């Protein structure tokens, strides 16, 4: 089943090294390609999965995680292919502009200075795709485990269930990011802006929670807000498009069949009373003739479904397994985060401001050096300036770099003589 899904994307396009691992640890062919590989490593995390939250076991998180995979892997891989023609088309234009000035003293000695720093950052960004390349499968895994899998659980079980999966992506010798996070590389700072605006929480949690739930396109995303903020922060979100609704308000079957004539976003509340009445549309079983799907007892036709519950204590049998389960419920290790986080901002807000301006600077760095980049190969297909332009940018953010690193461990410092104190507190 694995490999009939990941059979029809393009996978094999980096190198690998055969590991040496026991007979009984493999489950499908030989170990002879990537596919091989990833069908192990995913069901090897399976089976550690549903070993870690311990009844029949259903293969829908199979599925789900097979379709993710397949949809971040497409992406992130297009898009390198596209970054790597964009620095292969550049490094040929500067090679041929290199030619063309060398063919035609203090201006000479500048241009072949030019030149040589042009190649040097050439090879140190060939030599950075290349570990991008190495690591896009690896990341891709993360990404996608993390979307179908952790979405019902706390920060340190999730951790946990991180290490874990980073373990068996070593044991069969995948590489991945040792530094990995989902905000920083699937999030820009402008929805960050959206959802902190919106009226979201503070803390990284409830913004992971909030960015799988709308970043899962196969299954209905499943609330659990005990204290139902998610309900008005979708409410702003969304703006008029909301059509809130519940199983106890009598009129749902026309409130429902209005709003997916109509298209519009839909919230329901009371998840722990569903009526079966809407599992054809929670499990998207349309007939394509026009998109039609059965609802009730009569047949109808840019809709989306949410579920709302205030109640941490029952999920119907079959809906937890259509739909996109997450939590907003306080817990112990979420009491450690947000103590750890406001102990943070309120010793010293210099230090916090410091380096989140720092990221800021230098993610703002990078997109004008691209900008500046296109520009230069846009205009070639002057160049000192935009040279010097560039080496500044880069100098500016190594200095950046050097000085997050030189403040790492005082953040490292900081965390250990602040566990006492969660631990404490807990």
């Given at each position: ?214 970043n899962s396109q ?17 409410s702003n979100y ?160 190594e200095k950046k ?26």
């Amino acid at each position: 089943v694995a490999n009939n899904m990941v059979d029809v994307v393009p996978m094999e396009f980096t190198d690998f090294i055969v590991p040496e691992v026991n007979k009984e640890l493999v489950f499908t062919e030989p170990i002879q390609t990537i596919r091989d590989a990833v069908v192990n490593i995913l069901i090897h995390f399976d089976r550690n999965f549903y070993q870690k939250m311990k009844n029949p076991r259903s293969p829908g998180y199979f599925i789900d995680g097979l379709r993710a995979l397949v949809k971040l892997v497409t992406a992130k891989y297009q898009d390198l292919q596209e970054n790597q023609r964009f620095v292969n088309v550049g490094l040929e234009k500067l090679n041929e502009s290199v030619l063309k000035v060398n063919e035609l003293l203090d201006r000479s000695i500048s241009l072949v200075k030019s030149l040589t720093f042009e190649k040097e950052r050439w090879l140190n960004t060939t030599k950075q795709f290349s570990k991008t390349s190495q690591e896009l499968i690896g990341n891709c895994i993360i990404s996608s485990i993390y979307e179908t899998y952790f979405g019902h659980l706390n920060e340190r079980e999730r951790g946990d269930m991180l290490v874990i999966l980073k373990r068996l992506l070593g044991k069969f010798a995948v590489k991945y990011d040792v530094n990995y996070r989902f905000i920083d590389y699937l999030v820009t700072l402008d929805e960050k802006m959206k959802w902190l605006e919106c009226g979201l929480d503070k803390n990284d949690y409830f913004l992971e929670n909030m960015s799988i739930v709308m970043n899962s396109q196969d299954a209905v995303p499943f609330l659990l807000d005990p204290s139902s903020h998610m309900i008005t922060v979708i409410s702003n979100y969304y703006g008029n498009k909301t059509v809130l609704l519940s199983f106890l308000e009598e009129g749902f079957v026309k409130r429902l069949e209005n709003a997916v004539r109509f298209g519009s976003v839909v919230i329901i509340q009371d998840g722990e009373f569903f009526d079966p009445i809407i599992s054809r549309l929670i499990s998207r079983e349309f007939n394509h003739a026009r998109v039609t799907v059965e609802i009730g007892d009569h047949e109808v036709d840019d809709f989306k479904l949410f579920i709302h519950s205030c109640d941490p204590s029952d999920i119907p049998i079959f809906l937890r397994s259509r739909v996109r389960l997450v939590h907003f419920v306080t817990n112990k290790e979420s009491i450690e985060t947000r103590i750890f986080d406001i102990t943070l901002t309120e010793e010293n807000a210099e230090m916090q401001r410091k380096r989140e301006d720092l990221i800021k600077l230098n993610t703002e760095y990078r997109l004008k050096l691209k900008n500046l980049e296109k520009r230069l190969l846009e205009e070639l297909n002057e160049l000192m300036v935009t040279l010097n332009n560039l080496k500044k940018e880069a100098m500016n953010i190594e200095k950046k770099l050097s000085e997050s690193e030189e403040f790492f461990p005082q953040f490292d410092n900081l965390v250990e003589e602040y566990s006492i104190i969660g631990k404490h507190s807990v």
